[PDB]
Coordinates of C-alpha atoms in Angstrom, one line a residue:
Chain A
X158 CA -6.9 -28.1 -10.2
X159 CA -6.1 -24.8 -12.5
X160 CA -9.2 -23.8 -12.4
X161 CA -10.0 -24.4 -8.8
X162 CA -6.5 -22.5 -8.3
X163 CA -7.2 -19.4 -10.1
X164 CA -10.7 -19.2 -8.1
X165 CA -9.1 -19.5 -4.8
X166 CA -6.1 -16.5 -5.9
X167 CA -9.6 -14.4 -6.7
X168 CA -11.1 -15.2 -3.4
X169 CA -7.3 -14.1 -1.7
X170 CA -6.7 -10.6 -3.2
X171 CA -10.2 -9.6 -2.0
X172 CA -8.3 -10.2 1.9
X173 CA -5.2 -8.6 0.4
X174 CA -7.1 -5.4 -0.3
X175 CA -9.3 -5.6 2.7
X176 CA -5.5 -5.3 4.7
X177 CA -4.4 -2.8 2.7
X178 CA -7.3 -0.9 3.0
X179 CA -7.2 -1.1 6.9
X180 CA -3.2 0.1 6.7
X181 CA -4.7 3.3 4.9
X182 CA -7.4 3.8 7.2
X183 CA -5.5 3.9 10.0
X184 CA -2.7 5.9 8.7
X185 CA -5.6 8.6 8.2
X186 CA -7.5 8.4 11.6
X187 CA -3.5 8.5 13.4
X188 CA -2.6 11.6 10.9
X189 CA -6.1 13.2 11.7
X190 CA -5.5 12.3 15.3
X191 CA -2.7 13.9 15.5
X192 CA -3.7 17.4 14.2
X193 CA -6.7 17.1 17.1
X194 CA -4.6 16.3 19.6
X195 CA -2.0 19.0 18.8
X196 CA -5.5 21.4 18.5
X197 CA -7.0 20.0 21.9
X198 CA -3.6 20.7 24.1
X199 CA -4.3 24.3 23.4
X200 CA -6.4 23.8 26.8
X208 CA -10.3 21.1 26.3
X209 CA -9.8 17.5 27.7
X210 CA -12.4 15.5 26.1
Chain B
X211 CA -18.5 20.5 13.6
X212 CA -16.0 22.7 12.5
X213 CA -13.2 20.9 14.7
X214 CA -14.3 17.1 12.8
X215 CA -14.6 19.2 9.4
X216 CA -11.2 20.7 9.7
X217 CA -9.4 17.0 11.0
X218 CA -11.3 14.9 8.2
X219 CA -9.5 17.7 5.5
X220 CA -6.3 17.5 7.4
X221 CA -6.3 13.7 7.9
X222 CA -7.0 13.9 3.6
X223 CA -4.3 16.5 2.8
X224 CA -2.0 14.2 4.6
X225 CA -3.4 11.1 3.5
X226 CA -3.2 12.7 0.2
X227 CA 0.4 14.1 0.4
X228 CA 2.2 10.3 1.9
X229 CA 0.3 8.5 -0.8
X230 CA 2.0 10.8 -3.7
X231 CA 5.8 10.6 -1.6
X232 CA 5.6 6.8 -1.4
X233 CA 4.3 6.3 -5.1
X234 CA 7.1 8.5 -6.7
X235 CA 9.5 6.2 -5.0
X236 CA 7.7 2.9 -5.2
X237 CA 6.9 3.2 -9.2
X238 CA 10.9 2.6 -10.2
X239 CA 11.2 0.1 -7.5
X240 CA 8.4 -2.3 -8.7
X241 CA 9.9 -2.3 -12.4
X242 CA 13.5 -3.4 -11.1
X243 CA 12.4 -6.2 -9.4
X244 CA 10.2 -6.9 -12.7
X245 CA 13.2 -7.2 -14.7
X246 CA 15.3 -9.3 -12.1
X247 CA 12.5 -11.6 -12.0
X248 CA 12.2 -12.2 -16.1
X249 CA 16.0 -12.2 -16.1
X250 CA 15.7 -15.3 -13.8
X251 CA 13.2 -16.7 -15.0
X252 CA 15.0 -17.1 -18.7
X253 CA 18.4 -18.1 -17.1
X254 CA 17.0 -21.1 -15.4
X255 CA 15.8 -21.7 -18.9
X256 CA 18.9 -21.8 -20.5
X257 CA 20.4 -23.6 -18.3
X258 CA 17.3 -26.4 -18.3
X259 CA 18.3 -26.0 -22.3
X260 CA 22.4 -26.6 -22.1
X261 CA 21.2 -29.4 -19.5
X262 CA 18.5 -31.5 -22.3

């Protein structure tokens, strides 16, 4: 059961990163967003 | 070009700039909660000791 345990709390901080790496990601594309936005209401619609 | 160039540094700088603000705080946060946890951890002991 230890064993089978241990293998299983491998297999869930792969998910746990995969998250945390999509809270990142988008944190980034919103900031970058942003700062195009801002540069794109100078006029420029698209 | 120039306008995707200029966002992808931006969007680093900042990603860059939270990441160092958030891990300042977070690295005397995680050790507190460390030591609470231990401290616990070895009470419950004792008293599982006093008990047998």
């Amino acid at each position: 059961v230890l064993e089978q345990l241990n293998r299983d709390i491998d297999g869930i901080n792969a998910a746990i990163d995969g998250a945390i790496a999509g809270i990142v990601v988008g944190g980034l594309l919103v900031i970058g967003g942003a700062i195009v936005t801002a540069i794109g209401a100078v006029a420029s619609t698209p | 070009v120039v306008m995707g160039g200029i966002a992808m540094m931006t969007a680093g700088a900042g990603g860059v700039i939270g990441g160092a603000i958030v891990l300042d705080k977070s690295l005397s946060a995680r050790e507190k909660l460390y030591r609470d946890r231990s401290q616990l951890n070895s009470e419950v002991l004792v008293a599982s000791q006093i008990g047998s």
